[PDB]
């Protein structure tokens, strides 16, 4: 059988509709080279997302290759559990936490972002069971968060599209107003009051709840899933100031942002933000291994480790917990990370890959540009003038979805917003083949949309 | 002075599944290196593995097929995902894989990296799935005493060993635990094995009446109870429990993350019990733990269900970012090739009857209440009092001692409270057994003279 015969006949896809799948077929990507990546006949796409947000490095970096192939060599598994550790997640422990910001000192590993979430909430109920605080255990985020697919996870994630038919949020979970300048402004209101809003939004809730029963508040420092949205000026000082107050934890889930994508190592120094607890994935090992990080304060280690000397065990754990080769594989992305100086890059890199997005402000099928560092979103719509989305939100969307792969372009729509996310190590060549690309599909997708009667 | 991997260690690592306030006083262990069933800490001490680390390291801990298939893949496209249609030829080639090998009609494959976010993913299709029949009631699951079904939320609510639950607010979803089918614990003065079936299923039976069976989604369980005790189910029980879970329309998920690919002498447990699933979980041997995977295989019904969603609703919103990762899928395909080119089920059957009677062995010894196991899978569950099956004071005090000892006389085992358990790789010779139950019996000896020593008896 085929590639494709297999597929279609045995693969349940994610984030895929299952339907049209039946129809289509899948698209089988065979190779990576650099910033791009070649399907089964060998077409060539300049893959513009680096994946999901996450092939920091590229998709043919020997040097991790080679880090996974040294580990495997000499010790290919073995577990974290009771006093057993191994050499690579030591070594990635003790590097994360002289990279977090403030105390952020030990380090949890599990697999997915979804995985280290759902530890972080349940980490919290532990601490704050064990401080005798047992209502304080509510969680709040923010309509079009992503935190992940695990029931716990994903009652956090504030898509709706994603809870529908799930029966989540499955936690207590409140999810607040989506800090979005472009859609949600007031006419003529400035960002600072726009953040005014939304601090009091936040505050108001504590104070109808009651304080005593919300733990934390988890959020991106930019929403990328959900649309990239940058935050509207002055919101993460607003937020800080309302959680420290009420003594909610501040949870930032850099496992998009984490590792130079906004300019800074993590996005928290971009946006002054101080958190109490940070979760890494993604970048963290380039995708080339399943791995993410959990980072938290001394005084919630430890919590943690008076609970052990009441209750004899941490008794959490996932089998690839510390994974070596996966601990390896991502202590040498970090390194790579550090030696090239990609971060510095990123910040030289920017300034083009901003200006050719917002070179698109005054097309006709666009609404509203935004992005920081290498991260993009070009948001379509069916009239400017009242950014009115489109009939059947995701029509022109997925259009440019399949339409790029034409031109040898792989971005992501999120509905009809057109989100550009490049590998750390994409050059200046690399951007104007992006673009050159986009343009071609854009100019396909003006003449669809015509067509179709969508403006 | 402690090497940099322990100072690393110690500075910044948060242990799964251990003490933290011990691990500070005495820190970890490292492994450094594996060899076949062997591995070998930093100081070059060498331990047999007699759990295959966590019930997991099927080919051992130094198999370079499997290393040259990560290599092969890693040089070809070392990450690629499977959303919007994408995707690669190992997943491709392992999802027709299993469902070849998957009984009945469990005929396609959902991945995952862990089996937490398999039965969380599990959870997520039951209630999906029932929202699309129509039938929004139908959510509860039915888990068991001393289940381990995994970590996250959902996992670790479904999951019935209480310690796993305590102060974590779980379970956190609506689950009903049955009694753990426990003969050895459990039965009456003089009831027979089936008999004691007969209970079980009459009380899950009451339980789906009481609660109303329209509001019943899914009964989950392993063939054999393995973090729990290794606990083999009472003659006839998997029978007796399908008949009720089917006459009441109730979903039935087996979860073979340890039992699957040759444990128990069968390629699945399901096989060895006579089960047939609506819903398999496959996890650690799935790959030897080399690469983190994990996946769901359901029923053409529970596919046809999905796919009716993604018509109205657009899309399957559910994914882990490295689903279907290339490099780990084509792990677990040349470690399933592995097993069935060294046929290393029919390896298991050989060595079965050895490795049990070495345990039985055991059954006369003054410290031992119960014996138990199947397969390649053991347990030596030591007591208190034999006559009452009296657990001890502090349970955990002598499975804790045995434990630690067995690593100086070369030995690795996994001590569930005072329940010993045994879980070496399928590539195990004949040799490596007769080694792990002499280095067993000079770690039971020494257990025998310090529980004395401490007044334990």
Redesign the interface.
């Known amino acids: 059988?085929s590639?494709?015969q297999?597929?279609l006949?045995?693969?349940?896809?994610?984030?895929?509709?299952?339907?049209?799948?039946?129809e289509?077929?899948?698209?089988?990507?065979?190779?990576?080279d650099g910033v791009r990546?070649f399907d089964?006949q060998g077409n060539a796409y300049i893959e513009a997302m680096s994946?999901?947000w996450?092939?920091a490095l590229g998709?043919?970096?020997q040097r991790?290759?080679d880090a996974?192939?040294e580990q495997?060599?000499?010790?290919?598994?073995?577990?974290?559990?009771?006093?057993?550790?191994?050499?690579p997640?030591?070594?990635l422990?003790?590097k994360?936490?002289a990279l977090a910001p403030g105390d952020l000192?030990?380090?949890?590993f599990?697999?997915?972002?979804?995985?280290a979430n759902?530890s972080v909430?349940?980490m919290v109920?532990?601490v704050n069971?064990?401080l005798g605080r047992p209502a304080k255990?509510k969680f709040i985020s923010r309509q079009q968060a992503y935190h992940?697919?695990?029931?716990?996870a994903?009652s956090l994630t504030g898509?709706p599209?994603?809870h529908?038919?799930?029966?989540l949020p499955?936690?207590p979970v409140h999810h607040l107003t989506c800090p979005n300048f472009y859609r949600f402004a007031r006419p003529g209101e400035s960002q600072e009051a726009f953040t005014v809003r939304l601090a009091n939004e936040l505050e108001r809730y504590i104070l109808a709840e009651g304080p005593e029963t919300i733990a934390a508040f988890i959020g991106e420092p930019v929403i990328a899933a959900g649309g990239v949205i940058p935050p509207p000026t002055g919101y993460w000082a607003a937020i800080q100031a309302v959680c420290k107050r009420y003594d909610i934890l501040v949870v930032i889930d850099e496992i998009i942002t984490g590792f130079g994508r906004l300019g800074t190592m993590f996005g928290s120094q971009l946006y002054g933000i101080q958190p109490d607890i940070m979760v890494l994935?993604?970048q963290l090992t380039?995708?080339?291994?399943?791995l993410a990080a959990?980072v938290?304060s001394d005084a919630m280690?430890d919590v943690?480790?008076?609970?052990?000397?009441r209750?004899?065990?941490?008794?959490?754990?996932?089998?690839?917990?510390?994974?070596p080769?996966?601990t390896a594989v991502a202590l040498e992305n970090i390194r790579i990370i550090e030696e090239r100086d990609l971060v510095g890059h990123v910040q030289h890199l920017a300034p083009v890959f901003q200006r050719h997005l917002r070179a698109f402000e005054d097309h006709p099928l666009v609404g509203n540009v935004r992005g920081v560092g290498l991260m993009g979103g070009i948001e379509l719509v069916a009239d400017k003038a009242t950014r009115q989305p489109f009939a059947q939100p995701?029509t022109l969307g997925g259009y440019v979805?399949k339409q790029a792969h034409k031109h040898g372009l792989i971005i992501?729509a999120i509905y009809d917003t057109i989100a550009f996310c490049p590998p750390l190590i994409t050059t200046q060549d690399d951007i104007e083949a992006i673009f050159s690309a986009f343009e071609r599909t854009l100019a396909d997708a003006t003449d669809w949309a015509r067509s179709q009667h969508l403006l």
Not at 72 to 81: C, E, T
Not at 105 to 108: A, K, S
Not at 304 to 309: A, G, W
Not at 314 to 319: C, D, E, Q, R, S
């Open positions: 059988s590639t494709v297999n597929d006949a045995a693969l349940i896809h994610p984030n895929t509709n299952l339907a049209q799948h039946r289509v077929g899948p698209l089988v990507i065979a190779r990576g990546v089964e994946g999901l996450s092939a998709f043919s970096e991790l290759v996974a192939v495997f060599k000499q010790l290919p598994y073995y577990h974290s559990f009771s006093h057993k550790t191994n050499a997640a030591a070594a422990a003790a994360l936490a000192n030990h380090v949890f599990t697999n997915s972002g979804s995985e759902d909430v349940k109920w532990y069971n064990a255990k992940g697919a695990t029931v716990a994903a898509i599209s994603m529908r038919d799930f029966d499955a936690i994935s993604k380039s995708s080339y291994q399943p959990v938290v280690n943690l480790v008076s609970q052990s000397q209750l004899g065990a941490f008794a959490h754990g996932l089998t690839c917990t510390g994974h080769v996966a995701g979805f992501r």
